[PDB]
């Protein structure tokens, strides 16, 4: 009826709303494994009692997964119950029976957990002590370039044949580097003064770059460079401006501290204090 008809046609309306799914099907064993296995199960007499599933097709899984991987969630599939990922069990296609399926979506949910912990931290930036801000900036710069790939592949669904095993395999050298961040960030989740909490995180990066002393090392390198960036500024400020930096004791020098600047530290102190003794002269 002129609005509802266009809605009905050019919007699916069958895996997110109360409506049984329809799609023209190509039967005959080579793509019919779910229905074949269903009939086999019933013939062996379980006795019957089916599984509550609404029959969703193949590509809808692909679109829903891409949105889960991009960084958003709370879709119709893959909801949270306390902030823990959970797979819907009403999914089954006219093939694969949903036994391999529950497992492949379990791996995708496991990566969604890794992105959920990060988004919880990043959202609580807005409701941050200039090193945490410079750390958030590194995470954010990763997230934009990372979100690009997931949007760009979703464009090719609107164009082209696409299946699951290509887009899973394609994201292996991206989900690999993400797990390294899941382990570096766990030490910054482990937690004192905020500068002690910052040193406990910051020393992990300085250790992790020498661990691979490639592509992981350039990532950890770029995460390192943007977080010692406040400190190089403030030590230069102590040298030329002749005063110790006050940031509610955000500064690592005692006048709790990493091994980065330790082998040259006496040359920092012996320059800053001597400049301060020139300010009084």
């Amino acid at each position: 009826p002129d609005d509802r008809s266009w809605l009905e046609h050019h919007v699916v309306h069958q895996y997110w709303t109360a409506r049984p799914s329809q799609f023209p099907h190509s039967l005959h064993l080579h793509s019919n494994l779910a229905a074949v296995w269903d009939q086999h199960l019933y013939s062996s007499d379980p006795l019957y009692v089916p599984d509550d599933r609404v029959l969703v097709t193949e590509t809808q899984v692909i679109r829903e997964t891409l949105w889960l991987l991009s960084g958003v969630k709370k879709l119709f599939i893959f909801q949270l119950i306390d902030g823990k990922v959970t797979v819907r069990n009403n999914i089954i296609v006219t093939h694969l029976t949903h036994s391999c399926l529950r497992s492949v979506l379990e791996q995708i949910a496991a990566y969604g957990q890794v992105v959920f912990r990060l988004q919880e931290f990043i959202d609580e930036v807005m409701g941050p002590f200039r090193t945490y801000q410079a750390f958030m900036w590194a995470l954010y710069k990763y997230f934009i370039s990372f979100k690009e790939e997931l949007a760009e592949i979703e464009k090719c669904i609107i164009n082209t044949t696409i299946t699951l095993a290509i887009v899973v395999d394609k994201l292996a050298p991206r989900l690999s580097q993400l797990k390294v961040l899941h382990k570096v960030f766990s030490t910054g989740v482990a937690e004192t003064r905020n500068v002690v909490r910052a040193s406990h995180l910051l020393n992990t990066l300085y250790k992790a770059i020498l661990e691979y002393d490639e592509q992981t090392v350039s990532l950890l390198f770029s995460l390192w460079v943007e977080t010692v960036r406040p400190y190089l500024q403030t030590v230069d400020e102590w040298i030329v401006h002749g005063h110790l930096w006050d940031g509610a004791r955000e500064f690592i020098i005692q006048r709790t501290m990493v091994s980065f600047l330790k082998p040259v530290l006496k040359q920092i102190i012996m320059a800053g204090k001597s400049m301060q003794l020139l300010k009084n002269l």
């Binding site: 997230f143 949007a151 464009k155």
Partner: protein, 234 residues
Amino acid sequence: MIHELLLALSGYPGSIFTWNKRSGLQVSQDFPFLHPSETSVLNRLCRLGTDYIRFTEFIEQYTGHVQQQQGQGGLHGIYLRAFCTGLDSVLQPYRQALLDLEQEFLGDPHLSISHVNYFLDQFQLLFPSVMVVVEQIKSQKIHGCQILETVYKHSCGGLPPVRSALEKILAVCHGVMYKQLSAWMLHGLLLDQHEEFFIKSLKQFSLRVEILPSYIPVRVAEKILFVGESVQMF
């Protein structure tokens, strides 16, 4: 979606995105075309338009609103105008981005909502941050030179977009202070009435020490005070 999203984000909201004064922009929930997949992207998209409407209301509120004076001075004066004028100059790439979005919509309108979210993620961090600076400026009814200190303190952060954006507004507000300083040191005349510019020979030309900005030492204020008192004397 096509005209509506740009219309809502630009600050001319409708009935899909009902503007509230207590939640900003908000979609009217479940429809038989709106479903939980696109919903989260929509909710994240609403924040930009919320902050934008607040910004433009504030800019209109404190720019061009008097004709040389009710009689309050915390709700009037040159520094409020200068802040709103600087914020209007900073907001230009958001408007430009929405223009380019419409051009791509015309070329093909089958662009998903997450695509627009992907382009506008660089304003997605910048808009919630600056909102508390401008909100504190309104709520605390700030008077005199303390506006400069308030924005200078938040330009010490570790997020480059936010820091650069607030620093430009502080430069705009420096413009007015330099303009009154061109008068008091050179003759002694004031230009800014009822709002402080950290300076008033002797008394009726003395230094007001307390209001002085935090990036300026007291020593240079003594030097300025000498120049003004002496040029007034001879």
